[PDB]
Amino acid sequence: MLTELEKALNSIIDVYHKYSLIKGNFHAVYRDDLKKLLETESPQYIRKKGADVWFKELDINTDGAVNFQEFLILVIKMGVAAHKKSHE
């Protein structure tokens, strides 16, 4: 059985696929999909930046959606922000 940390990493994969499997490409979170992702998965201090501001920054190749590679940019930034938040 996987450890709690390893289960947490696979759970992050499940979180992304709850919004990338909605429509279109299986590994693409579109601008409307990211809005539903942010409003449901991210805290208020992350949502306050704006869904459109997040999408323009996450869409690295500017193809119209957020793949799993670009989604890990959000997980990294959310993890660093949540770590500093625990020491406040």
Binding site: E4, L5, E6, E41, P43, G79, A82, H83
Partner: protein, 108 residues
């Protein structure tokens, strides 16, 4: 809180379980980083745990400011890589046409 927040908290909790032991309580030294990988990453890094020198070079690659300590900012890159490798394992040789996840990293 959401599912993603609880997953991130598990990363922060697991990091703090060992960083507080020796030296600076908010960073991982070589001993603390080895214990985290040996126990909490015994499946995702099962082959790397068999060679201690490989574990040392992973921390050296993660230690970007070269202070022989792993801050949370440097440590979370390892979490993103293992999450990426686990998803790549699920689509190893995927032919479609739909979406399906095979057993991920560490046969889990």
């Amino acid at each position: 809180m959401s599912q993603l927040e609880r997953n991130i908290e598990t990363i922060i909790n697991t990091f703090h379980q060992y960083s507080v032991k020796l030296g600076h309580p908010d960073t991982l030294n070589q001993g603390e980083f080895k214990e985290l990988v040996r126990k909490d990453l015994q499946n995702f890094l099962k082959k790397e745990n068999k060679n201690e020198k490989v574990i040392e070079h992973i921390m050296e690659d993660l230690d970007t400011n070269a202070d022989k300590q792993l801050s949370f900012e440097e440590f979370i890159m390892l979490m993103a890589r293992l999450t990426w490798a686990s998803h790549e394992k699920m689509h190893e040789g995927d032919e479609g046409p739909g979406h399906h996840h095979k057993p991920g990293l560490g046969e889990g």
